[PDB]
């Protein structure tokens, strides 16, 4: 209805938000680090990083952290404003319960925010930002690459038997647990690695056979330039077969090594074919999500308690809540739209969910309080 | 945004009904 | 004007959208894969991937796919609602044509969506997400690097003549078809590669000359630490000149190899100087673009047919359309603004284009139908 | 109040914007390159690149550049419209000053845009998009890696003394100026590099000791597969100790090399632990920021001059400005919200700052002009 | 958004003219 | 957007005061 008192007290809340944001902007960076610790922990250690799209995203993130810190630390102020707004005397034996109201609301919001952070943030960020199936396969592939590297070192030392043994073991382990161009590129890299290892190892005596193997690899590269991947594969197979002649007594062993290389290449291609959705997390989106969660859970823990405390003395009877449930749902949905920075219905519903839950818990608490009062009377 | 506006308008017309 | 029937039937459409979105959310992932197949196919095989900026972008994408699937499969429902909305009796010999109206509108939207997908999506995603000039140069550079690697292997085998021949051929092929620090880094890497190849190859006899070459490379690194790139280039040239002394009879050949390395480094720098706009595609933007295209083309194929079918029986005479053309353009522009999630005028115009085209085709079809009716009469 | 003349002249401004955007769209790419030169220059040479998130971001960027070029080159048109809008005769000895008004406003906007570009853009993009502390550490790490590579080459040449000397010098230089898994992976890579160098160097005589070293490395990889990083570190230390036996007289030297490798690995891990915020700049955000800055500074240089020129003849007395200061601040804030594409209060304030500054400078200039006129009279 | 709103407002005032 | 709208509304109610 009227604006005067509402506008004045909204101005009080706004100036409180401004001053507390000014003070909290000093420690914006430590607060941002604390907020980002859960999401970073949920990320893999090898890719524990966040990207920033814009050049002012540091400034935007710091300003958002300051604004949200101000609005969080002004909750006692808005609680006092709300308590003063409704004060018809309230049977002044019951109007003295101001400090209990403000204190209970403040600790309710603080506990909601703390529980949000500690419980929800690590668990949910583990739920979303973790695959646990492609990561295990990637780790298995990295381990297999390490065993292949060890086999190549054994080859470089002139130990064909140990290299073949390791190659067979790795192939068995991989079997127990893709575009043509990509697979051909991987196979070419594997052939180059095997040729380099053989050149380092048996390059003092069998200099005439590695020359033929390298010529066959050159033929493979030529058949890879003009896309004739069948000829490229045939040339790589011939190169490996000739490479097997550097150690005639361990030919099978060398063959096994080549097989492993091919397998690894194939496997890697399969992995890069399977993972068409890589993570690249952003500063502002993650900050917005974390702040939205904390604010939503603070609302969830505060609105029921504030409503119940009003109902103990009586400012909102159950009749008014039942009459205005639909309008309250709508106004909560508009508030969720305002808070959410992204203009999508999905985020609107995700934000409005906590608001509706808080309202429902509040009305349940009010009804329970009224029933207990009636039973006592 | 426009999507949020159309959503709030749809909700407002929806709660009252025909 | 009045709300009653409009609001009730809008509620019917909304509940239909909700239920069909609930059912379609089960198959959100296969639908998303089908939608993303064209854009992924347009991407290069080596970088066939999409990134997600936010942790809830999977959920947002799935929810958007479900909502759009619901709004697509509710088109028959909205067609029945529209047909019922206008029914003054319509000379009931002509009011029985309800099922033809709904069926024709439904298949029109389905055909529009299918044609959108199959024709437009691959072709346009090839038009935008493909360079075909920097990719060809990158492939040529990769092939040249492969030939240089083969020449280095030939050097590692002690074959200086073949290595020089391959280096000369690759240099000729590159010639037939950049920051100082970056070029110096690339040249240092090339010198390191050449020194490693020479150490593997002629490291059994010429151990005294590669030592001097490595000392000159150390001088180059020192002159690269403090930015004196002229001295770094001079030291690298001296290192290569000393490396040429490992095989005195093939000095030119070795020189050629070094030249090729330098050329490759230069070329690579040029490429990284030319490509200042790399692709990094996102999940939600690509999904929004694909859904916007499909919806726009469904509108293009449906609105003319719906308008023509109304004109056959007569609900929208040409006079009303001519009178309300400007208001219809405005309302279509607001609808395009609502559908587009990005708050930019460019996307607004891009969306409103199809709407205006659909309206114009509809009015042309209505006029043609009226002219044919007048000619028959 | 009335719409007629305001709407007609707004239509004139809009059609001028449309035609100048149509002409300026021809040269959208060179203008975009000129606009992006400062931000690219502020970026490191090795990562001088910008990413595009969407497939139509080229088209969106070009359209935005064309629209903003049209609105910049239409400033004389809007100046003539404003001058004509207020013309009650203006004591026609003073109404003839139309061309001075339009010319002065046009050059004021041009000078503001030019000063914005040349002064602000390089300096501020250096301030934000430059770390200068992590980049120096990264360069130091790259130099240390280069010295380690030179030491490894010296080892490959059989020169253990020089390799140990370089390793000790690099370790001293690094000392003068992290997850367990990442550090173990880096240490494994360093051990592999050292083993490869030793195999190339002393692989002709000490073939029996490098075999034991490689077996110990295999044990390290096994203890790395099942996460027992303590055993992995012990096995790597044993492998390096055995590798020291290839040259018994230079054992310490080899030990030093291993130490350096470990140190480098540790250092690299620390760096990747410290840098949890990597830059990945986008096309549209950077273009929006640059255009916003140029427009804001053009407003800063134009609005005071336009207001002062109106005050010389008198259309806006100081009384009207003092009365309407609050409403002018609000309307400037709404204008800043309209211009800014991102729906955040931070960008709204950042845009509204220049508008308020321009208004304040304008009112100061008007007051100074009035005071000078009173003193003259 | 604000840009879409100003665009629709400009279009509304534009179609009617002076 | 909604944030810009609530900001302009807050400013409008703020300049006038109680």
Automatic annotation (TrEMBL), chains A, C, D:
Single biological process term from Gene Ontology: intracellular protein transmembrane transport
Family assignment from sequence similarity: Belongs to the TatC family.
Protein name per its UniProtKB record: Sec-independent protein translocase protein TatC
Lipid bilayer topology: Multi-pass membrane protein
GO cellular component, one term: TAT protein transport complex
Lineage: Bacteria, Pseudomonadati, Myxococcota, Myxococcia, Myxococcales
Endpoints of the signal sequence: none
Organism: Myxococcus xanthus
Residue ranges of coiled coil: none
Annotated GO MF terms: proton motive force dependent protein transmembrane transporter activity
UniProt subunit comment: Forms a complex with TatA.
Keywords carried by this UniProt record: Cell membrane, Membrane, Protein transport, Translocation, Transmembrane, Transmembrane helix, Transport
Function (record text): Part of the twin-arginine translocation (Tat) system that transports large folded proteins containing a characteristic twin-arginine motif in their signal peptide across membranes.
Pfam family, one: TatC
Chain ranges passing through the membrane: 65-86, 98-120, 289-316, 328-346, 352-369
Protein localization: Cell membrane; Membrane
From TrEMBL, chains B, E, F:
Subcellular location field: Membrane
Stated name of the protein: Twin-arginine translocase B
Organism: Myxococcus xanthus
Coverage span on the entire protein: 5 to 22 of 182
């Amino acid at each position: 209805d009227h604006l005067t008192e509402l506008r004045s007290r909204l101005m009080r809340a706004t100036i409180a938000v401004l001053i507390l944001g000014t003070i909290s902007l000093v420690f914006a960076k430590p607060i941002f680090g604390l907020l980002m610790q859960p999401v970073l922990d949920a990320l893999p250690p090898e890719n524990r990083s966040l990207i920033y799209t814009s050049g002012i995203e540091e400034l935007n993130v710091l300003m958002k952290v300051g604004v949200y810190a101000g609005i969080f630390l002004t909750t006692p102020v808005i609680l006092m404003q709300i308590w003063g707004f409704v004060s018809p005397g309230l049977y002044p034996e019951e109007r003295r319960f101001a400090a209990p109201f403000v204190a209970f609301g403040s600790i309710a919001f603080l506990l909601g925010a703390a529980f949000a952070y500690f419980a929800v943030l690590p668990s949910m960020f583990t739920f979303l930002l973790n695959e646990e199936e492609t990561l295990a396969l990637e780790q298995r592939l990295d381990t297999a690459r390490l065993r292949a590297d060890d086999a190549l070192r054994f080859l470089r030392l002139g130990e064909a038997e140990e290299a073949g043994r390791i190659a067979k073991e790795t192939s068995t382990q991989l079997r127990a647990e893709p575009a043509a161009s990509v697979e051909m590129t991987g196979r070419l890299d594997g052939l180059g690695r095997l040729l380099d290892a053989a050149s380092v190892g048996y390059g003092a005596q069998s200099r005439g056979v590695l020359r033929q193997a390298v010529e066959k690899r050159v033929e493979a590269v030529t058949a890879y330039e003009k896309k004739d991947f069948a000829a490229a594969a045939a040339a790589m197979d011939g190169s490996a077969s000739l490479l097997a002649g550097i150690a005639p007594t361990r030919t099978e062993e060398l063959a096994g090594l080549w097989r492993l290389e091919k397998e690894l290449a194939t496997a890697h291609a399969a992995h890069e074919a399977a993972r068409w959705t890589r993570p690249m997390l952003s500063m502002h989106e993650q900050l917005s999500l974390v702040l939205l969660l904390i604010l939503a859970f603070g609302i969830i823990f505060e609105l029921p308690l504030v409503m119940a405390l009003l109902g103990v003395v009586g400012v909102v009877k159950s009749s008014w809540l039942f009459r205005y449930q639909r309008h309250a749902f709508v106004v909560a949905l508009i508030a969720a739209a305002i808070i959410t920075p992204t203009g999508d219905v999905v985020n609107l519903s995700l934000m409005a969910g906590p608001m509706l839950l808080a309202y429902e818990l509040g009305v349940l608490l009010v009804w329970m309080v009224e029933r207990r009062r009636a039973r006592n009377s | 945004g426009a999507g949020e506006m159309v959503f709030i308008l749809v909700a407002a017309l929806l709660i009252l009904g025909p």
